[PDB]
Amino acid sequence: MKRAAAKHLIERYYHQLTEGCGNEACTNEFCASCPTFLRMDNNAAAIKALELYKINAKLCDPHP
Ligand SMILES: [Zn+2]
Numbered sequence: 001m002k003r004a005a006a007k008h009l010i011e012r013y014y015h016q017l018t019e020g021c022g023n024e025a026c027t028n029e030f031c032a033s034c035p036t037f038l039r040m041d042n043n044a045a046a047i048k049a050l051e052l053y054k055i056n057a058k059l060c061d062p063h064p
Contacts, residue, residue: 010049016028016031016032017031018042020037
């Protein structure tokens, strides 16, 4: 029943709030490493990970 693909998708949103997406040039309010980000808790980052997940908002995919 554990959806690994879904859990990691949520973890990419969670990573997006906690650590960001690495790039300096990101203008996403729902994302760290962006000027528009306010420092939230990891509990709040996981809550907002689920919010952005279910609505399928602007996710920053890791593309080297
Ligand atoms: Zn970003």
